[PDB]
Short mmCIF file of N, CA and C in Angstrom, two decimals:
data_model
loop_
_atom_site.label_atom_id
_atom_site.label_comp_id
_atom_site.label_asym_id
_atom_site.label_seq_id
_atom_site.Cartn_x
_atom_site.Cartn_y
_atom_site.Cartn_z
N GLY A 1 13.40 45.35 -61.15
CA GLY A 1 14.80 45.36 -61.35
C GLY A 1 15.39 46.84 -60.88
N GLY A 2 16.71 46.85 -60.74
CA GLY A 2 17.33 47.97 -60.23
C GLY A 2 17.29 48.21 -58.75
N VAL A 3 17.48 49.39 -58.32
CA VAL A 3 17.49 49.92 -56.98
C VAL A 3 16.54 50.90 -56.67
N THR A 4 16.36 51.18 -55.31
CA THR A 4 15.42 52.28 -54.84
C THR A 4 16.40 53.22 -54.13
N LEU A 5 16.39 54.47 -54.62
CA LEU A 5 17.20 55.52 -53.94
C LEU A 5 16.30 56.26 -52.95
N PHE A 6 16.94 56.97 -52.07
CA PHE A 6 16.34 57.71 -50.94
C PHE A 6 16.73 59.08 -51.10
N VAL A 7 15.70 59.97 -50.68
CA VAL A 7 15.90 61.46 -50.76
C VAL A 7 15.77 61.99 -49.36
N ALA A 8 16.52 62.96 -49.06
CA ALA A 8 16.42 63.76 -47.82
C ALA A 8 15.30 64.69 -47.84
N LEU A 9 14.40 64.61 -46.79
CA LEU A 9 13.15 65.42 -46.61
C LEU A 9 13.61 66.73 -45.93
N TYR A 10 14.55 66.77 -45.13
CA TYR A 10 14.95 67.90 -44.46
C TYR A 10 16.52 67.99 -44.39
N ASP A 11 17.06 69.22 -44.06
CA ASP A 11 18.42 69.30 -43.84
C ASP A 11 18.93 68.62 -42.40
N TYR A 12 20.05 68.13 -42.33
CA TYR A 12 20.58 67.69 -41.13
C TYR A 12 22.13 67.88 -40.99
N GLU A 13 22.45 68.43 -39.80
CA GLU A 13 23.82 68.75 -39.36
C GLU A 13 24.35 67.55 -38.44
N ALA A 14 25.23 66.80 -38.90
CA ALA A 14 25.79 65.73 -38.13
C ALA A 14 26.55 66.27 -36.92
N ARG A 15 26.42 65.44 -35.79
CA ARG A 15 27.19 65.75 -34.70
C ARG A 15 28.49 64.86 -34.48
N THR A 16 28.67 63.95 -35.34
CA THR A 16 29.87 63.02 -35.40
C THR A 16 30.10 62.69 -36.79
N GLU A 17 31.41 62.56 -37.05
CA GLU A 17 31.83 62.29 -38.56
C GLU A 17 31.42 60.97 -38.97
N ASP A 18 30.88 60.01 -38.08
CA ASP A 18 30.34 58.77 -38.61
C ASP A 18 29.10 58.97 -39.38
N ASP A 19 28.36 60.12 -39.03
CA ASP A 19 27.08 60.41 -39.69
C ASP A 19 27.30 61.54 -40.76
N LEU A 20 26.50 61.37 -41.88
CA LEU A 20 26.59 62.41 -42.90
C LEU A 20 25.80 63.62 -42.56
N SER A 21 26.24 64.79 -42.94
CA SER A 21 25.48 65.95 -43.03
C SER A 21 24.86 66.11 -44.35
N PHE A 22 23.63 66.60 -44.53
CA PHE A 22 22.99 66.59 -45.79
C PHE A 22 21.92 67.75 -45.87
N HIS A 23 21.48 67.91 -46.97
CA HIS A 23 20.57 68.95 -47.32
C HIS A 23 19.27 68.38 -47.99
N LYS A 24 18.12 69.08 -47.79
CA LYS A 24 16.92 68.62 -48.30
C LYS A 24 17.08 68.38 -49.83
N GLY A 25 16.63 67.34 -50.39
CA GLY A 25 16.62 67.03 -51.76
C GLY A 25 17.89 66.17 -52.25
N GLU A 26 18.82 65.94 -51.41
CA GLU A 26 20.10 65.09 -51.69
C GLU A 26 19.55 63.72 -51.73
N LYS A 27 20.16 63.01 -52.60
CA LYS A 27 19.83 61.55 -52.78
C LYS A 27 20.99 60.66 -52.36
N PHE A 28 20.53 59.32 -52.01
CA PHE A 28 21.44 58.45 -51.43
C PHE A 28 21.11 57.01 -51.93
N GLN A 29 22.08 56.19 -52.11
CA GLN A 29 21.93 54.77 -52.25
C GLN A 29 22.14 54.26 -50.90
N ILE A 30 21.34 53.25 -50.26
CA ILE A 30 21.44 52.81 -48.91
C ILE A 30 22.27 51.54 -48.95
N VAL A 31 23.52 51.66 -48.37
CA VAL A 31 24.53 50.56 -48.20
C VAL A 31 23.99 49.44 -47.38
N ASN A 32 23.48 49.79 -46.10
CA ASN A 32 23.03 48.83 -45.22
C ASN A 32 21.84 49.45 -44.40
N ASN A 33 20.75 48.76 -44.29
CA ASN A 33 19.65 49.18 -43.46
C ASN A 33 19.17 47.93 -42.49
N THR A 34 20.08 47.08 -42.16
CA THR A 34 19.65 45.92 -41.42
C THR A 34 19.99 45.94 -40.04
N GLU A 35 20.65 46.96 -39.53
CA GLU A 35 21.23 46.98 -38.24
C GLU A 35 20.40 47.91 -37.22
N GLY A 36 19.61 48.70 -37.69
CA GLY A 36 18.85 49.70 -36.91
C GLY A 36 18.15 50.71 -37.71
N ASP A 37 17.73 51.76 -36.97
CA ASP A 37 17.07 52.98 -37.63
C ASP A 37 18.00 54.03 -38.15
N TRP A 38 19.29 54.00 -37.78
CA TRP A 38 20.32 54.69 -38.61
C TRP A 38 20.75 53.77 -39.66
N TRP A 39 20.92 54.23 -40.88
CA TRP A 39 21.23 53.43 -42.00
C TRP A 39 22.54 53.92 -42.62
N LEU A 40 23.48 53.09 -42.97
CA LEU A 40 24.66 53.51 -43.75
C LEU A 40 24.19 53.69 -45.18
N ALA A 41 24.68 54.94 -45.66
CA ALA A 41 24.20 55.48 -46.97
C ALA A 41 25.39 56.11 -47.68
N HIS A 42 25.21 56.12 -49.01
CA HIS A 42 26.32 56.67 -49.90
C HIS A 42 25.61 57.82 -50.71
N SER A 43 26.00 59.08 -50.34
CA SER A 43 25.51 60.23 -50.89
C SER A 43 25.86 60.36 -52.44
N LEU A 44 24.93 60.60 -53.28
CA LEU A 44 25.17 60.87 -54.63
C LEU A 44 25.62 62.28 -54.91
N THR A 45 25.62 63.06 -53.87
CA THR A 45 25.95 64.58 -54.08
C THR A 45 27.53 64.67 -53.65
N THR A 46 27.82 64.08 -52.54
CA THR A 46 29.19 64.32 -52.00
C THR A 46 30.09 63.03 -52.26
N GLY A 47 29.50 61.82 -52.66
CA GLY A 47 30.21 60.69 -52.76
C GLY A 47 30.46 60.00 -51.41
N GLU A 48 30.29 60.63 -50.27
CA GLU A 48 30.62 60.09 -48.93
C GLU A 48 29.63 59.07 -48.49
N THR A 49 30.13 58.28 -47.69
CA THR A 49 29.39 57.13 -46.95
C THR A 49 29.34 57.39 -45.47
N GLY A 50 28.25 57.20 -44.90
CA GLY A 50 28.10 57.41 -43.44
C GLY A 50 26.67 57.14 -43.04
N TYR A 51 26.50 57.14 -41.69
CA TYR A 51 25.05 56.88 -41.09
C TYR A 51 24.16 58.05 -41.45
N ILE A 52 22.87 57.85 -41.70
CA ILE A 52 21.84 58.81 -41.89
C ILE A 52 20.65 58.27 -40.98
N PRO A 53 19.91 59.27 -40.49
CA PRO A 53 18.79 58.94 -39.62
C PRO A 53 17.60 58.61 -40.59
N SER A 54 16.93 57.35 -40.35
CA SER A 54 15.98 56.93 -41.47
C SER A 54 14.72 57.82 -41.49
N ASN A 55 14.42 58.52 -40.35
CA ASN A 55 13.22 59.44 -40.34
C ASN A 55 13.39 60.73 -41.11
N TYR A 56 14.58 60.98 -41.64
CA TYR A 56 14.95 62.12 -42.52
C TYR A 56 14.93 61.81 -43.96
N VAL A 57 14.62 60.58 -44.43
CA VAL A 57 14.60 60.26 -45.82
C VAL A 57 13.33 59.55 -46.19
N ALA A 58 13.10 59.52 -47.48
CA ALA A 58 12.02 58.64 -48.06
C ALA A 58 12.36 58.07 -49.29
N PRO A 59 11.88 56.93 -49.71
CA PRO A 59 12.29 56.35 -51.07
C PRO A 59 11.79 57.16 -52.15
N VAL A 60 12.53 57.34 -53.11
CA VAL A 60 12.12 58.12 -54.31
C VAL A 60 11.25 57.09 -55.12
N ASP A 61 10.03 57.61 -55.52
CA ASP A 61 9.12 56.69 -56.09
C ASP A 61 9.41 56.63 -57.55
N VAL B 2 24.78 50.75 -27.33
CA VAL B 2 24.18 50.83 -28.69
C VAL B 2 25.24 50.99 -29.77
N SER B 3 25.16 50.21 -30.74
CA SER B 3 25.97 50.38 -32.03
C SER B 3 25.39 51.64 -32.68
N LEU B 4 26.17 52.06 -33.76
CA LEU B 4 25.82 53.19 -34.51
C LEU B 4 24.46 53.26 -35.06
N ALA B 5 24.05 52.09 -35.47
CA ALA B 5 22.82 52.02 -36.16
C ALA B 5 21.67 52.27 -35.29
N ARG B 6 21.81 51.83 -33.89
CA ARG B 6 20.83 51.82 -33.02
C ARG B 6 20.73 52.94 -31.99
N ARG B 7 21.41 54.13 -32.30
CA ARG B 7 21.33 55.22 -31.52
C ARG B 7 19.97 55.93 -31.71
N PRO B 8 19.54 56.66 -30.75
CA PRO B 8 18.14 57.42 -30.91
C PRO B 8 18.24 58.28 -32.12
N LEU B 9 17.08 58.30 -32.82
CA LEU B 9 16.89 59.18 -34.02
C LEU B 9 16.72 60.64 -33.47
N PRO B 10 17.15 61.58 -34.43
CA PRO B 10 16.93 63.06 -34.05
C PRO B 10 15.41 63.32 -34.09
N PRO B 11 15.01 64.22 -33.45
CA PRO B 11 13.55 64.67 -33.62
C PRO B 11 13.38 65.15 -34.99
N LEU B 12 12.09 64.99 -35.50
CA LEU B 12 11.75 65.67 -36.74
C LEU B 12 11.93 67.24 -36.51
N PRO B 13 12.31 67.90 -37.59
CA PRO B 13 12.35 69.34 -37.39
C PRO B 13 11.09 69.97 -36.84
#
């Protein structure tokens, strides 16, 4: 039951406002992951929604 | 490519 959250493994500085900038340890709920290897995510730190690179996050066990 | 399908950044 419930959801799986994801955590940033590394800092990332976005180059476009479509993408989130984030810091190691930030957590996200994934809004959509069905379109490719960048995923639409909702940061629990900033409340923002934007694309994140899937190789920079891992599921929180 | 759509936003989801752009190349990924290299790992640090």
